[PDB]
RNA sequence: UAUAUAUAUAUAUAUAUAUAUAUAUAUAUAUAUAUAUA
RNA sequence: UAUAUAUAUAUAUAUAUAUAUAUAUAUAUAUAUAUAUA
């Protein structure tokens, strides 16, 4: 491969290491990283010359047809709009224009350019129209290019490097070498052809270059001109090329994707063109697979347990597939082909359909094909001008087909109107439901509990926030002089900052401020319009409390919130799998825009009236959250009007209804556009975070229930449909979360419902939603779409396109981040490639290349010095990336499921133990006195020679700079503290409780001499945590950066030869692997697409353990003792301390002090303390006391039973008696089991039984040291 | 899958074709002119008539 | 001039039957290559 | 040379899918004729 010869020497070495030829070393690790940072990026394109492509792809010159930008922008009413070219009002995206004329030249790199300083000045100072339009166009065009985790060229360099040389085979019988090869990929050939336009003297000038402040462009010569779309096309091509290789797809499918992108790029508005024909691929493949005759195969047999509210499922065998079970819904070929005819891409459909017809039976190949084809959709984070986005989304109002007549209301109650009893229909149903819930909320001593009140107030504060300026204005307007703490370096717009200002003020004085402006933000998306973030101010968030509370009660006490408890997201996995099984018919539904359709004229007025009436049952004089009862005029009786008191809850409703009727008033201040901030109101619900899911899920459930039980039976025609539609209820037939929803039909007896009845049913539902202005957007394709998860016949399909390898969202014109953060990006990037099942061997190779580039970085003072550093590669091992090849071992023996942290280290060393010991003896002189785990052979020196300690400690170092304090600012720190504590401790009982607990605790901890300095979670530190978070949200000063680099280097250079005490002790255990465990399911049945004999290790791991989490006796430790806690503190810290105390045998008052330290009253403290026992605790619950946790990668596997009865901590016939844990086994055995299973999961291949065989020291010695360490911390 | 699909659904038609109906003539023997009669136009006129 | 109904012709779509072509799967025969045995 | 296994090609048979042609039925559009109304 001449390309391998083209690489420079260090990169050739790195490629050899990645191929598994040689063990990786820090030396070559640096040489590769360094040289990448010094050579120009264009050379990566230069590498493409040495690929003899043989693919049938032609790049039409139609691409280079820049449409003039001047006609794509205009300003009216002093705002820069997009003025769409086509008559479609949605063409509001970046056009296809030549950016060239707007460029100057840089002094550093003369070839590339940036915006004219003249243009931006005139747009800023003169507000000149054309200047502003040019600026806006330049800003957004640059931003669209910036939507990548790093420069795409670097990723392309990674792909070439790994693909430059075939990987060496391992000894495994399932290690199939790659079937795909270069010179056959249409993507790379396409990149070659298109890039031929950008060379002048064989130099291959990149069309653009991304920088921290955005992206720069190259000035074209007089002959040529660069269209911004080309850059986007390159990114899509590179992303597709990487994905195709990792997914190992046929070149034909990649060919179709290339043609797909080219056609989109040829026309104007590359983004808009792609967006229009988005769903073509899933419709062609996923929605229509088995609509033929030769159907068959094996399918999972999943059963839903009787208490369906618990969402518990059981795998109970397999089911043979046959024609009677084949999908009933019509295919999707006709509409898709009709759409494709518009863009004359019918060939793509013909190719896809013909290829699809080669999979008549459901098996691994079929789903693998589906996974690959669905991976063809564009992975670009689309971005448009926020001004257009806000103008296009919130300009919608629902259309009600039968409005509530005005005569249907009673007389006013000051603001609200009650609903007349004579009114029926869905509105009546909605009214009663909310009213009933309001009644239940009304009398509930759960509130007025001071602890619960603390939870609600604390829930309102986060590091982020907004609308602070509106807050300061509104209160200053009403004569309220708020405090300030600027010297305490914390952002004013933080929700924390405004909360501190409010602490002292009597609440009712603030009531006028709730009718104030709210700022807004935008977050871009991959396959849809960008999302919206609308953070209310703290006061508004407080007022809306009743709305949330009632919604919560509706959810938690009707359909159990339809999984909106979100305890572990994986509970939806078995649900959709069950929903997609052949015996069941499922329908996917979701509100078209629930945020935009909920409104006051129809919905909120009804809810407000119901809540206000529902609160009538209760003491009319009972203040709630500092809101006192007031007098309101009642005008229900025209003959006898009067005024009566109303409780604080009702007063809240009175104002809340007023606000909703007035409509939200937003203020847009987009930065990408130029000087165009303004404010306009809308009825669109905020819906900026999970706090909105409760309301929409409640209304979603309510309307669905009424439709099923009342509207549909009264209106449908088919008698058979009526027969099956009856005996159906939401609690066992429907789930939802926000707009999203799933509806599944009762099992038709050995049969399926007529599509005719389905059409009748679906039609009526659409009309039902049309009544009150909900577009239901339903579909029926015998698949499962819920929370962006896809299941087909009980097999999960990872939609990889939603996690593009290169793409990353950036919501601001500047990246605003520092170099070390890139490491965390790499770690998160790699995990997705594990969550989604890719070719695990090749994905690992690519990951290391990414890591190598990220391993190095530098910084420069605003005026002064530069700084630099880089990590030894062992860091990434500690961070959770398996090594490819260790010295003395064979490559590719470590599975991706290897746990991060100490566990991964221990497992690696445990396997590597014997070779290290023997090799150290030959190579080095013995150490001077005996070692606990090692002999005299002195492996630690060898590890230092490998730089293991350097990497091990380097990964421990922090990666974000720290802000500095000040003393007059500390007066503000105290002022900030005092007020935060004041806001937290509204009453006095909590303060007395915490103070008593803290005083007793330190007294006990010192006098009993457990230890001193134990940072125990307590409420007094919660404000401190808030303050630190608030100060951290600020951009750090350069001095902090310099401290980081210096500290990091010193930590790297310091010669240390010891791990943490825990890892040192963990090495004392010897673990061995026996035979394979009995299988969970039939290996024939596919469960996750791509986890097949080709991708062996995933296929092994899933097959052995089974995917369905089925903790019938374990419950994965979710039964934490402290169900109710305040924000800021960590439950996982609290229970760990409690168990640690219990193991240490502390006296009960120690528990009492600790519990009282977090607000628990003495009585409940005793009650809680009594529950603490080593028996009822779960394996993971107790094992976490020493930070032994379950890796996130395991959350999709049924590891419970294995850990329970497959990891033998003491097998009688194998273990040495020295390792017998004896009585301490009650808390020793879980630790050993966790270590054992971690090692077993580390190695590749099938899961084997794990057995402790020996502890070098006695088990007693191990337990004693552990108790010491537990007492120390 | 063929056998399983066959054994599970009996609505595969393939029933014997019982109903066949005739509206013509219930006969199976045809009277046939084997040797045509000669046409006479000069001598023996009138001995045959068509 | 227009609307409605009926008949006839032509075009398009859907269903069924027959013919031809192409693709895929399975079986059998023949040829060629590679491996093993004699 | 023969046997056995694997791969590829060609031929034949059977099944499935798609396309094209012809026939029949149904729907829609257009034209022409006839009737009725304006």
Residues 6+ apart with CB under 8 A from A1061: A1265, A1269
Nucleotides of D under 7 A from a protein CB: 15-17
Return the residues preceding each gap in chain A, C–N over 2.5 A, or none.
none
Residue numbers in B near A294 (CB within 8 A): 1
Residue numbers in A near B9 (CB within 8 A): 323-324
Method of structure determination: cryo-EM
In whole angstroms, give the CA distance from residue A868 to residue A859.
6
**Two tokens at A63?**
């691409």
Specify whether the CB–CB gap between A476 and A516 falls below 8 A.
Answer: no
The answer to whether the C-beta of A354 is closer than 7 A to strand C is: yes
Chain B closest CA to A363's CA: distance in Å? 13
Q: Does A1084 touch chain B (CB under 8 A)?
A: no
Chain A closest CA to B12's CA: distance in Å? 11
In whole angstroms, give the CA distance from residue A619 to residue A67.
69
Specify whether the CB–CB gap between A591 and A776 falls below 8 A.
Answer: yes
In whole angstroms, give the CA distance from residue A198 to residue A207.
7
Which of A751, A744, A776, A773 lies closest to A763 in space, CA to CA? Answer: A776
**Two tokens at A931?**
């070692």
Which of A395, A418, A420 lies closest to A657 in space, CA to CA? Answer: A418
Nearest CA in chain A to B4: A322
Residues 6+ apart with CB under 8 A from A125: none
**Two tokens at A419?**
């609903």
In whole angstroms, give the CA distance from residue A776 to residue A741.
10
Specify whether the CB–CB gap between A613 and A435 falls below 8 A.
Answer: yes
Specify whether the CB–CB gap between A1241 and A1071 falls below 8 A.
Answer: no
- Name A936's bridge partners: none
- Name the pairing type of β-strands A297-304 and A409-412: unpaired
> What are the backbone angles phi and psi of residue A463, rounded to the nearest 5°?
-65, -40
Rg (CA), chain A: 32
**Two tokens at A954?**
């380097």
Residues of A815-845 as b/e, b for ≥16 C-beta within 10 angstroms? beebbbebbeebbebbbbbbebbbbbbbbbb
Q: What's the Cα-to-Cα distance from A991 to each of A391, A902, A1151, rounded to whole Å?
A: 49, 39, 19
In whole angstroms, give the CA distance from residue A352 to residue A256.
8
In whole angstroms, give the CA distance from residue A1204 to residue A1234.
10
Which of A451, A523, A598, A526 lies closest to A990 in space, CA to CA? Answer: A451
> What are the backbone angles phi and psi of residue A992, rounded to the nearest 5°?
-60, -45
Which among A290, A292, A322, A324 is the top mutation candidate for probing chain B, defined by the most B β-carbons within 10 Å of its own β-carbon? Answer: A322
> What are the backbone angles phi and psi of residue A298, rounded to the nearest 5°?
-110, 145
In whole angstroms, give the CA distance from residue A1079 to residue A1198.
12
CB within 7 A of nucleic chain D: A 292-294, 357, 360
3-state SS of chain B: helix, strand, coil percent to 5?
15, 0, 85
Specify whether the CB–CB gap between A623 and A629 falls below 8 A.
Answer: yes
In whole angstroms, give the CA distance from residue A93 to residue A753.
43
Chain B closest CA to A255's CA: distance in Å? 35
Q: How many CB pairs under 8 A join A and B?
A: 20
Nearest CA in chain B to A325: B5
Q: Does B5 touch chain A (CB under 8 A)?
A: yes
> What are the backbone angles phi and psi of residue A148, rounded to the nearest 5°?
-140, 145
In whole angstroms, give the CA distance from residue A1080 to residue A1147.
45
* Residue that the structure tokens 């984070």 belong to: A381
In whole angstroms, give the CA distance from residue A433 to residue A419.
13
State the CB neighbour count (10 A cutoff) for residue A979.
19
The answer to whether the C-beta of A350 is closer than 7 A to strand C is: no
For chain B, what is the largest distance between any 2 Cα atoms, rounded to a whole number of angstroms? 82
Q: Does B4 touch chain A (CB under 8 A)?
A: yes
Report the Cα–Cα distance between both ends of chain B, in Å, rounded. Answer: 69
Helix (H, G, I), strand (E, B) or coil at A676: coil
Q: What's the Cα-to-Cα distance from A1163 to each of A228, A993, A1166, A1168, A1169, rounded to whole Å?
A: 69, 12, 5, 9, 10
Beta-strand ranges (E) seen in A208-359 are 208-211, 214-218, 297-304, 313-321
Which of A483, A514, A444, A448 lies closest to A986 in space, CA to CA? Answer: A448
The residues of A between 640 and 699 with beta carbon within 7 Å of nucleic strand C are none
Specify whether the CB–CB gap between A932 and A915 falls below 8 A.
Answer: no
Residues 6+ apart with CB under 8 A from A744: A579, A584, A585, A586, A587, A733, A734
Specify whether the CB–CB gap between A980 and A1027 falls below 8 A.
Answer: yes
**Residue A253 CA to nucleotide C29 C1', Å?**
37
User: Which helix (H) or strand (E) is A1070 found in, with range?
Assistant: strand A1069-1076
Specify whether the CB–CB gap between A103 and A116 falls below 8 A.
Answer: yes
Q: For residue A358, give the nucleotide whose C1' atom is nearest its CA.
A: C24
- Name A869's bridge partners: A857
Are A295 and B1 a contacting pair at CB < 8 A?
yes
Which of A911, A896, A900 lies closest to A841 in space, CA to CA? Answer: A896
Specify whether the CB–CB gap between A401 and A101 falls below 8 A.
Answer: no
Helix (H, G, I), strand (E, B) or coil at A53: coil
**Two tokens at A557?**
């006490």
Q: Which of the 8 DSSP states describes residue A562?
A: G
* Torsion A970-A973-A979-A984 (CA) sign: negative
Resolution limit in angstroms? Answer: 3.3
Are A294 and B1 a contacting pair at CB < 8 A?
yes
Which of A197, A37, A156 lies closest to A858 in space, CA to CA? Answer: A37
Are A324 and B5 a contacting pair at CB < 8 A?
yes
Which of A253, A22, A177 lies closest to A839 in space, CA to CA? Answer: A177
* Torsion A437-A440-A441-A446 (CA) sign: negative
Q: In what order do the strands lie in the sheet with A586-590?
A: A586-590, A740-744, A734-737
Specify whether the CB–CB gap between A270 and A378 falls below 8 A.
Answer: no
Q: What's the Cα-to-Cα distance from A1227 to each of A203, A320, A1064, A1140, A1215, rounded to whole Å?
A: 67, 46, 19, 10, 19
Q: Using CA atoms in the order A469, A470, A475, A477, what is the torsion angle rounded to 10 degrees?
A: 100
Residues 6+ apart with CB under 8 A from A911: A1239, A1242, A1243
> What are the backbone angles phi and psi of residue A605, rounded to the nearest 5°?
-60, -45
Which of A964, A948, A956 lies closest to A1047 in space, CA to CA? Answer: A956
Residues 6+ apart with CB under 8 A from A323: A293, A295, A296, B1, B5, B9
* Torsion B40-B44-B46-B50 (CA) sign: negative
In whole angstroms, give the CA distance from residue A135 to residue A115.
8
Q: What's the Cα-to-Cα distance from A362 to each of A292, A374, A1124, A1201, B8, rounded to whole Å?
A: 12, 17, 47, 30, 19
Are B4 and A320 a contacting pair at CB < 8 A?
yes
Tell me how far the alpha carbon of residue A790 is from its chain's centroid: 17
C-alpha atoms less than 13 angstroms from C-alpha of A1055 in its C-beta half-sphere: 6
Q: In what order do the strands lie in the sheet with A678-682?
A: A518-519, A664-668, A678-682
Residue numbers in B near A324 (CB within 8 A): 5, 8-9
Write the secondary structure of A202-240 as one string of H (helix), E (strand) and C (coil).
CCCCCCEEEECCEEEEECCCCCCCCEHHHHHHHHHHHHH
Which among A323, A326, A363, A1084 is the top mutation candidate for probing chain B, defined by the most B β-carbons within 10 Å of its own β-carbon? Answer: A323
Specify whether the CB–CB gap between A684 and A596 falls below 8 A.
Answer: yes
């Amino acid at each position: 491969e001449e390309l391998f010869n083209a690489l420079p020497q260090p990169l050739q070495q790195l490629s050899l290491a990645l191929a598994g030829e040689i063990p990786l070393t820090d030396h070559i690790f640096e040489q590769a990283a360094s040289t990448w940072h010094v050579q120009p990026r264009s050379l990566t394109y230069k590498l493409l010359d040495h690929i003899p492509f043989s693919t049938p792809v032609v790049v039409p010159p139609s691409i280079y047809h820049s449409l003039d930008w001047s006609k794509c922008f205009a300003v009216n009413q002093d705002r820069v709009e997009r003025v769409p070219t086509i008559d479609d009002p949605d063409d509001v995206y970046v056009p296809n224009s030549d950016i060239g004329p707007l460029l100057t030249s840089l002094h550093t790199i003369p070839d590339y350019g940036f915006l004219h300083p003249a243009i931006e000045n005139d747009a800023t100072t003169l507000r000149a129209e054309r200047a502003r339009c040019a600026s806006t166009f330049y800003k957004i065009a640059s931003s669209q290019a910036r939507q990548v985790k790093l420069d795409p060229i670097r990723m392309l360099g990674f792909l070439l490097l790994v693909q430059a040389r075939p990987r060496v085979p391992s000894g495994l019988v399932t290690d199939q070498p790659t079937r795909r090869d270069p010179t056959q990929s249409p993507a790379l050939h396409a990149i070659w052809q298109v890039m031929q336009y950008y060379k002048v003297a064989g130099v291959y000038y990149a069309p653009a270059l991304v920088v921290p402040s955005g992206a720069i462009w190259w000035i074209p010569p007089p002959g040529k001109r660069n269209v911004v779309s080309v850059q986007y096309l390159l990114t899509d091509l590179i992303n597709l090329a990487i994905l195709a290789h990792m997914t190992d797809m046929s070149p034909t499918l990649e060919l179709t994707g290339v043609l797909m992108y080219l056609r989109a790029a040829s026309s104007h508005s590359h983004a808009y063109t792609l967006l229009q024909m988005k769903s073509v691929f899933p419709a062609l493949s996923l929605r229509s697979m088995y609509r033929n005759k030769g159907f068959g195969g094996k399918a999972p047999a999943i059963e839903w347990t009787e208490p369906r509210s618990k969402y518990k499922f059981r795998w109970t065998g397999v089911t043979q597939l046959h024609d009677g079970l084949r999908p009933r819904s019509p295919s999707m070929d006709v509409p898709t082909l009709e759409v494709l005819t518009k863009y004359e891409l019918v060939d793509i459909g013909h190719i896809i359909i013909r290829e699809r017809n080669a999979h008549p039976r459901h098996n691994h190949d079929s789903v693998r094909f589906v996974r690959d084809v669905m991976a063809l959709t564009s992975g670009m984070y689309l971005v448009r001008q926020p001004t257009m986005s806000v103008l296009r989304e919130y300009s919608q109002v629902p259309d009600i087909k039968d409005p509530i007549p005005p005569s249907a209301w009673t007389g006013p109650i000051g603001n609200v109107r009650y609903l007349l009893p004579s009114v029926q229909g869905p509105a009546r149903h909605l009214y009663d439901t909310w009213r009933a819930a309001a009644r239940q909320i009304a009398q509930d001593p759960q509130w007025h509990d001071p602890l619960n009140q603390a939870i609600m107030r604390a829930q309102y504060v986060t590091a982020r926030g907004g609308s602070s300026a509106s807050l300061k204005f509104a209160l200053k307007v009403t004569g309220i002089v708020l405090p300030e703490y600027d010297d305490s370096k914390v952002k004013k717009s933080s929700k924390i900052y405004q909360a501190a200002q409010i602490a002292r003020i009597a609440f009712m004085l603030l009531i006028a401020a709730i009718h104030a402006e709210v700022t807004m933000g935008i977050r871009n998306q991959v396959q849809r319009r960008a999302r919206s973030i609308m953070p209310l101010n703290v006061i508004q968030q407080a007022i809306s409390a009743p709305h949330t509370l009632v919604a919560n009660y509706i959810n938690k006490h009707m359909n159990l919130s339809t999984t909106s408890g979100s305890v572990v997201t994986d509970k939806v996995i078995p649900l959709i799998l069950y929903a997609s099984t052949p015996p069941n018919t499922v329908v996917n539904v979701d509100i078209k825009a629930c945020d935009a359709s909920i409104t006051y004229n129809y919905f909120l007025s009804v809810i407000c009236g119901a809540m206000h009436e529902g609160f009538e049952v209760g003491n009319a004089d009972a203040a709630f959250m500092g809101v006192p009862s007031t007098i309101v005029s009642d005008r229900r009786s025209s003959v006898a009007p009067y005024s009566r008191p109303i409780s604080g809850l009702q007063t809240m409703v009175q104002h809340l209804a007023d606000l909703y009727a007035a409509g939200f008033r937003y203020s847009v201040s987009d930065a990408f556009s130029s000087g165009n901030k303004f404010s306009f109101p809308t009825s669109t619900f905020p819906s900026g975070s999970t706090a909105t899911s409760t309301e929409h899920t409640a209304n979603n459930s309510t309307m669905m229930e009424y439709f099923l039980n009342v509207h549909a039976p009264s209106h449908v025609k088919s008698a058979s449909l009526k027969r099956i539609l009856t005996d159906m209820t939401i609690q066992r037939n429907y789930v939802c979360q926000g707009d999203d929803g799933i509806l599944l039909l009762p099992h038709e007896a050995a049969s399926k419902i007529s599509a005719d009845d389905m059409n009748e049913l679906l039609t009526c539902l659409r009309d039902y939603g049309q009544l009150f202005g909900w577009n239901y957007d339903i579909d029926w394709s015998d698949t499962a779409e819920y929370l962006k998860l896809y299941a087909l016949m009980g097999c999960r399909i990872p939609n990889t396109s939603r996690h593009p390898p290169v793409g990353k969202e950036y919501a601001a014109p500047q990246t605003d981040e520092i170099w070390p953060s890139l490491i965390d990006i790499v770690i998160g990037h790699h995990l997705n490639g594990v969550t989604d099942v890719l070719n695990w061997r090749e994905w690992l190779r690519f990951s290391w290349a990414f890591a190598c580039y990220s391993s190095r970085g530098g910084y420069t003072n605003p005026k002064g010095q530069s700084f630099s550093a880089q990590y030894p590669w062992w860091t990434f091992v500690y961070l959770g990336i398996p090594p490819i090849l260790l010295p003395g071992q064979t490559p590719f023996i470590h599975s991706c499921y290897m746990p991060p942290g100490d566990q991964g280290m221990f497992s690696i060393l445990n396997g590597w133990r014997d070779w290290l010991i023997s090799h150290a003896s030959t190579t080095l002189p013995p150490l001077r006195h005996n070692h606990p785990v090692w002999g005299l052979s002195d492996v630690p020196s060898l590890l230092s020679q490998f730089g293991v300690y350097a990497g091990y400690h380097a990964a421990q170092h922090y990666r974000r700079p720290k802000p500095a304090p000040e003393t007059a600012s500390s007066d503000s720190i105290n002022q900030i503290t005092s007020d935060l504590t004041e806001y937290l401790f509204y009453d006095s009982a909590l303060k007395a409780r915490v103070m008593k607990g803290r005083y007793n605790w330190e007294r006990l901890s010192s006098s009993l001499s457990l230890n001193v300095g134990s940072r125990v979670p307590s409420l007094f530190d919660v404000p401190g945590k808030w303050v630190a978070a608030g100060r951290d949200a600020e951009k750090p000063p350069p001095s902090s950066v310099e401290d980081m680099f210096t500290s990091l280097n010193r930590c790297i250079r310091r010669p240390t030869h010891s791990f943490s005490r825990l890892l040192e002790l963990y090495l004392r255990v010897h673990v061995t692997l026996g035979e394979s465990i009995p299988l969970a399911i039939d290996p024939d049945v596919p469960q996750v697409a791509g986890a097949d004999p080709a991708n062996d290790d995933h296929w092994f791991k899933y097959t052995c353990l089974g995917d369905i989490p089925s903790a019938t006796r374990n419950y994965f430790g979710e039964s934490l003792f402290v169900g109710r806690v305040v924000s800021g503190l960590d439950v996982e810290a609290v229970d760990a301390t409690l168990l640690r105390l219990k193991i240490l045998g502390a006296p009960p008052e120690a528990f009492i002090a600790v519990l009282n330290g977090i607000g628990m009253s003495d009585s409940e403290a005793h009650q809680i303390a009594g529950r603490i026992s080593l028996a009822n605790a779960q394996l993971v619950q107790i094992a976490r006391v020493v930070h032994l946790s379950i890796p996130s990668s395991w959350m999709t596997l049924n590891t419970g039973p294995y850990i329970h009865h497959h990891a033998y901590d003491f097998k009688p016939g194998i273990t040495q008696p020295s390792a017998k844990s004896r009585d301490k086994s009650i808390w020793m055995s879980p630790i050993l089991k966790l270590l054992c299973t971690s090692y077993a999961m580390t190695v590749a291949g099938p899961v084997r039984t794990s057995i402790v065989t020996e502890i070098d020291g006695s088990a007693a010695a191990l337990s004693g040291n552990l108790r010491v360490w537990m007492r120390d911390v | 899958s063929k056998h399983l699909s066959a054994y599970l659904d009996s609505a595969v038609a393939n029933g014997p074709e019982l109903i066949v109906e005739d509206t013509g003539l219930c006969t199976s023997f045809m009277l046939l002119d084997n040797i045509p009669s000669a046409h006479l136009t000069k001598e023996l006129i009138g001995f045959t008539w068509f």
